[PDB]
C-alpha cells in the first residue's frame, strides 16, 4: 500500500528541515548583529546572549525532532523502492516514476537531494552529539567570545549539505568546510594555555590529509570531466590510476580518522581542548572521514590487495590498545580508546562494498555515544575536583556516588555486555575477520579486548575507589540533573538502538 | 607499627631489617636501641611460634625464652665494635629469617592490617556542609558580610547559565507610577 | 627527598573565565603530584639512538617490527584463502557503485 | 563497627532505617508481581515442551519436523 504520498513526504521533510535550520540561523545572526554595536556580551540580566542561547538550543532540539520523523520516512521509502524493482518480473513494464519539485523553496546549490542510510546515520549523530556538546559549553562562553554559540548550527548545516548531495565536488567542499570552526573553537574557547599549539598541530595534520584527498579529487575530476557519482559507472580507471587514487584517499582520510602513524595531533588536541569540543571531535567529526572514504571507495573499481591497509589499521588498533596501561590522565586514556575503536571501524571499509560495511556503520554510532559519555564523565570529574589525573583524585565513590556509579556502568558498556550495540558491532566485524583471517582475528581480539581493556579498567577503577582524605574543605557535590539525564540518555540510546530495524545493518 | 612488609616493592634485606628492627636503616640506632629492638622481635617471633602455634609446648617455650634472655643480657653489656656482638646479631637475624612466615598474623590495630581503613570517617567540614538550607538554616542574604569587604552573593553550587530573561506574571501592571504621579502634580 | 622547588604548573589563557562549580573552592596542589602530572609530556630523549636500548633491546625491536609481522601473517593467510577460494583481501566491486540503501529516482 | 556520624547533605546509605518500610515494601512488591505476571503471560505463548508420557509423535503429522524442497 505504498504510494506517492510517502515519497513526497520524505523528500519535502528532507529539504524543509534544512531550510528551517537555515532560517533559524539567519534570524538569530541578524538579531545578534543588529542589536548592539560591538556584538559582545553586556554582562547584565537583559543580554541578548540569553536569547541567543535558548534559540540555538531550541533549534537543534526541534530540528532533531523533525529529523527523527524525516528519518523514519526515508526508511520506509527506501524499503519500498527496492521492492518496486524486485517484483517487476514482467518484461514489458519497468518502474518509470518521475517526480516534481516543490514550489516554495529553491534547491540549495542547484542540486537534487539524494540520501542514503549511512548519511542519515551521520546526520543523526551530528544532531545528538552537537546537542550534548553545546550543553557542555555553557561555562566556557562569556564576555567577548559568545559568538561561538553559533558553531554547532553551522556544523549541522554543513553536514546536512554534505550528506544530501550526489555532487562529488560539493561533497569535497563540504568536507573541507569543517576545519575553520573547529580551529576557532579550540583557539578562542579553550582555557588551557597549551591549547594554542595544539590547535596548530590539529590544523597542520588535518590539512595534510585534506591535501592528499584534494590531489585524489583533482585526479578524478580532471580525468573524468564530471561531478556526478553516476557518470563514474561509464568510465574505467587503469591499474595505476586506481592504485594512486586508493592510496591517496586512504592516507588522506586516515589523517583525520586517525590511523596508526598519525594520531599525535588527536592526542594533543584532546588533552588541551575544551570538554564540549572534545565530545564533538571524538563523537562526530572523525566520522566525517569514514563517510567520504566509503563513497570514493565504492564509486571506483580497484584491483589491488587490501592487505597493506588492513595491516595499517590493525597496527593502529594494537598500538593504541597497548598504550592504555601507562596513562594517568583520564582524557588521554579516553583519546586512546577513541583511536583504537576508530581504527577498528576503519578496518571494516577495507573490503569494498561487501557486507563488512554494516558493522562499521553501526560501530560508528556506537563509538559516537561511548566517546561522548566518556568525555562527559571526564568533564564532570575535572569540574568537580579541578583535576583529571589519577595521582591527584581517587575515591570518586563514597563522595558524590552517582559519578562513580556512572563510571562503573560506562566501564561495563565499554567492555561490551551482550545486551548493547557494542557487542553487536564486535560480533559483525569479528565474524567477518575470523572468516577472512583467523589468526589475525584472534590476535586483534586478544590485544584489544584483554590488554587494552585491562589498562583502561585499572586506570578507571583506581580513580573510583579509595578514600578521599586530602581536602575535605573543598570536596564537591554530586551530579546535577543535566549531567544525570545526559548519561542516562547515552545508556538508553545504546540499549534501545540494539532494537533497530534489521532491514538495514 | 605499620605492617607494609609486602605491599611495597621491598627487597628481602629491607624486609629483614624491618622485621628485626623497627626501621629500614638500623645504622642510625644506638647500641641499646638495637639490642632492645632485636630482643623484642625475637620474643615476638618465639611467642608467635611456640605459644600461638600448631602443637604448642609451654615447657619448651619457657626454656627457649630463658636461653634467649640470657644471651641478650650478655649482648647488652658488650661493646658495639666487638666481633662477638656482631656474631650475636647475625645469629638472631638468622633466627628471625628461619622462622619467617609468609602468612604472618597481623594485629588488626596496625596501620596496614587486613581490616584497616574499611570505613571513611567524615570530619566536621563535611558534617556542617549544607548549601541549600534544609538541615541548617540558610539566610536569604546567603552570607554575613564582614567589615572591610563589599557585599557579594555566594557562588552557587550549580553555575548552569542556561537561563531565560526574567519571568513576570501575565498582565503585570508595570507603569511608571511615580513619574505619572509627579507629572500630574506639576 | 625534598619537595620540588621548580616544576611545570597549570597555565590558563589570558582573560580566561574561571570554572565556578560547587561554590568555586580550589585547594592548594601538591608539588610532587603536579610534577608527575607534567613530567611525561615534557620528557625527551638525550642522545641519538638512545631509544633502541632503552628498556629491553629485544622487546623494543620486536615492537618496532610489528607492522611487518602483521603484513606477513596477512600475506600467508591470503595464500591460504587463494587456494581454498575464500574471501580475498580485495576491494570488492559487486554493486557497480550503487550505494547501500540509496534513493535512485528521476525528476520530470 | 562503632557508629559514627554521617553528613546530612550526603545521599549515602550508611545505617539507614526507614520507619515507613512496611507500606513501601507492599507498594514495591505487589506491582512487581503484577508486572512479572504480565511478562510470564506474554512468554508462555512462545514456550515449547516435549510430548507427555504415553504419547508419540506421528512422523507424517504437520507438527513433525520437516525438510526443505529445493
Amino acid at each position: 500500500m505504498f504510494n506517492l504520498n510517502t515519497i513526497y513526504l520524505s523528500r519535502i521533510f528532507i529539504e524543509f528541515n534544512f531550510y528551517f535550520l537555515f532560517f533559524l540561523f539567519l534570524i538569530s545572526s541578524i538579531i545578534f548583529y543588529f542589536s548592539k554595536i560591538i556584538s559582545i556580551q553586556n554582562l547584565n540580566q537583559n543580554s541578548v546572549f540569553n536569547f541567543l542561547k535558548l534559540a540555538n538550543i531550541f533549534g537543534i532540539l526541534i530540528s532533531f525532532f523533525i529529523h527523527i520523523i524525516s528519518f523514519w520516512f526515508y526508511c520506509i521509502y527506501s524499503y519500498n523502492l527496492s521492492l518496486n524493482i524486485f517484483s517487476d518480473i514482467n518484461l514489458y513494464n519497468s518502474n518509470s516514476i518521475e517526480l516534481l519539485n516543490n514550489s516554495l523553496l529553491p534547491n540549495y546549490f542547484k542540486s537534487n537531494i539524494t540520501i542514503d542510510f549511512f548519511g542519515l546515520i551521520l546526520l543523526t549523530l551530528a544532531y545528538i552529539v552537537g546537542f550534548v556538546s553545546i550543553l557542555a559549553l555553557d561555562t566556557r562562553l562569556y564576555w567577548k567570545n559568545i559568538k561561538y554559540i553559533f558553531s554547532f548550527t553551522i556544523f549541522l548545516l554543513i553536514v546536512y549539505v554534505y550528506v544530501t548531495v550526489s555532487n562529488i565536488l560539493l561533497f569535497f567542499m563540504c568536507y573541507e568546510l569543517l576545519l575553520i570552526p573547529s580551529f576557532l573553537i579550540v583557539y578562542f574557547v579553550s582555557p588551557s594555555r597549551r591549547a594554542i599549539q595544539a590547535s596548530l598541530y590539529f590544523v597542520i595534520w588535518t590539512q595534510l590529509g585534506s591535501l592528499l584527498v584534494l590531489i585524489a579529487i583533482s585526479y578524478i575530476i580532471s580525468i573524468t570531466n564530471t561531478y556526478e557519482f553516476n557518470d563514474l559507472k561509464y568510465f574505467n580507471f587503469t591499474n595505476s590510476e586506481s592504485t594512486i587514487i586508493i592510496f591517496l584517499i586512504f592516507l588522506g582520510f586516515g589523517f583525520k580518522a586517525p590511523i596508526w602513524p598519525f594520531h599525535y595531533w588527536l592526542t594533543k588536541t584532546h588533552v588541551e581542548a575544551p570538554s564540549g569540543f572534545s565530545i564533538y571531535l571524538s563523537g562526530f567529526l572523525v566520522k566525517t572521514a569514514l563517510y567520504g572514504f566509503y563513497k570514493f571507495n565504492t564509486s571506483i573499481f580497484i584491483d589491488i590487495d587490501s592487505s597493506i591497509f588492513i595491516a595499517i589499521c590493525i597496527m593502529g588498533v594494537v598500538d593504541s590498545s597497548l598504550k592504555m596501561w601507562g596513562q594517568t590522565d583520564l582524557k588521554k586514556l579516553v583519546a586512546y580508546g577513541t583511536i583504537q575503536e576508530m581504527n577498528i571501524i576503519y578496518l571494516a571499509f577495507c573490503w569494498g562494498d561487501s557486507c563488512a560495511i554494516l558493522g562499521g556503520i553501526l560501530f560508528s554510532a556506537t563509538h559516537a555515544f561511548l566517546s561522548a559519555l566518556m568525555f562527559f564523565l571526564v568533564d564532570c570529574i575535572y569540574r568537580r575536583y579541578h583535576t583529571r589525573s589519577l595521582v591527584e583524585v581517587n575515591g570518586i565513590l563514597h563522595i558524590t556516588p552517582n559519578l562513580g556509579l556512572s563510571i562503573l556502568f560506562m566501564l561495563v558498556f565499554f567492555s561490551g555486555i551482550p545486551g548493547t550495540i557494542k557487542f553487536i558491532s564486535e560480533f559483525y566485524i569479528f565474524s567477518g575477520l575470523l572468516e577472512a583471517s583467523p589468526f589475525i582475528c584472534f590476535i586483534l581480539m586478544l590485544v584489544a579486548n584483554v590488554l587494552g581493556l585491562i589498562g583502561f579498567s585499572k586506570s578507571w577503577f583506581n580513580a573510583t575507589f579509595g578514600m578521599p582524605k586530602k581536602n575535605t574543605k573543598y570536596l564537591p557535590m554530586d551530579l546535577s540533573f543535566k549531567e544525570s539525564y545526559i548519561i542516562l540518555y547515552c545508556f538508553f540510546f545504546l540499549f534501545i538502538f540494539s532494537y533497530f530495524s534489521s532491514i538495514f545493518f | 607499627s605499620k605492617a607494609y612488609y609486602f605491599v611495597k616493592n621491598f627487597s628481602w634485606a629491607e624486609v629483614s631489617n624491618l622485621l628485626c628492627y623497627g626501621t629500614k636503616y638500623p645504622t642510625v640506632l644506638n647500641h641499646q636501641q638495637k639490642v632492645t629492638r632485636l630482643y623484642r622481635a625475637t620474643l615476638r617471633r618465639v611467642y608467635a611460634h611456640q605459644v600461638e602455634g600448631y602443637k604448642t609446648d609451654f615447657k619448651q617455650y619457657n626454656e627457649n625464652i630463658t636461653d634467649i634472655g640470657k644471651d641478650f643480657n650478655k649482648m647488652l653489656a658488650l661493646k658495639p665494635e666487638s666481633l662477638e656482638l656482631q656474631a650475636y646479631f647475625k645469629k638472631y637475624e638468622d633466627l628471625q629469617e628461619e622462622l619467617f612466615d609468609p602468612a604472618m598474623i597481623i594485629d588488626e590495630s596496625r596501620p596496614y592490617a587486613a581490616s584497616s581503613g574499611r570505613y571513611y570517617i567524615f570530619d566536621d567540614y563535611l558534617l556542617k556542609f549544607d548549601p541549600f538550607g534544609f538541615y541548617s538554616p540558610k539566610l536569604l542574604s546567603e552570607n554575613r558580610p564582614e567589615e572591610a569587604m563589599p557585599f557579594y552573593e555566594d557562588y552557587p553550587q550549580n553555575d548552569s547559565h542556561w537561563n531565560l530573561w526574567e519571568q513576570f506574571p501575565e498582565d503585570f501592571e508595570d507603569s511608571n507610577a511615580e513619574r505619572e504621579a509627579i507629572l500630574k502634580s506639576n | 627527598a625534598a619537595p620540588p622547588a621548580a616544576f611545570f604548573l597549570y597555565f590558563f589563557v589570558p582573560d580566561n573565565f574561571p570554572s565556578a562549580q560547587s561554590g568555586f573552592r580550589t585547594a592548594s596542589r601538591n608539588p610532587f603530584q603536579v610534577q608527575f602530572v607534567f613530567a611525561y609530556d615534557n620528557w625527551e630523549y638525550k642522545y641519538c639512538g638512545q631509544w633502541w636500548s632503552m628498556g629491553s633491546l629485544a622487546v623494543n625491536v620486536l615492537f618496532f617490527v610489528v607492522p611487518l609481522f602483521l603484513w606477513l601473517i596477512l600475506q600467508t593467510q591470503s595464500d591460504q584463502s587463494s587456494n581454498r577460494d575464500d574471501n580475498s583481501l580485495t576491494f570488492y566491486f559487486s554493486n557497480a557503485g550503487f550505494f547501500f540503501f540509496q534513493i535512485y529516482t528521476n525528476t520530470g | 563497627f562503632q557508629k559514627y556520624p554521617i553528613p546530612r547533605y550526603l545521599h549515602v546509605g550508611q545505617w539507614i532505617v526507614n520507619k515507613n518500610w512496611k507500606w513501601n515494601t507492599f507498594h514495591m512488591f505487589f506491582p512487581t508481581a503484577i508486572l512479572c505476571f504480565m511478562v510470564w503471560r506474554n512468554s508462555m505463548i512462545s514456550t515449547a515442551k516435549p510430548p507427555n508420557y504415553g504419547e508419540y509423535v506421528d512422523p507424517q503429522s504437520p507438527v513433525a519436523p520437516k525438510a526443505i524442497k529445493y
Binding site: 601507562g326 | 570517617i121 | 627527598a1 610532587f32 611525561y40 | 562503632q2
Partner: peptide, 26 residues
C-alpha cells in the same frame, strides 16, 4: 562501661608523598 568518644579521624591517616612519582612507574 565507658563513654567512648567518636571514631577518630586518625583511622584514615593522610599520606604525605615524601618521594617523587616516577613516570617509569606509571
Amino acid at each position: 562501661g565507658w563513654d567512648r568518644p567518636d571514631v577518630p579521624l586518625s583511622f584514615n591517616p593522610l599520606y604525605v608523598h615524601k618521594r617523587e612519582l616516577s613516570i617509569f612507574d606509571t
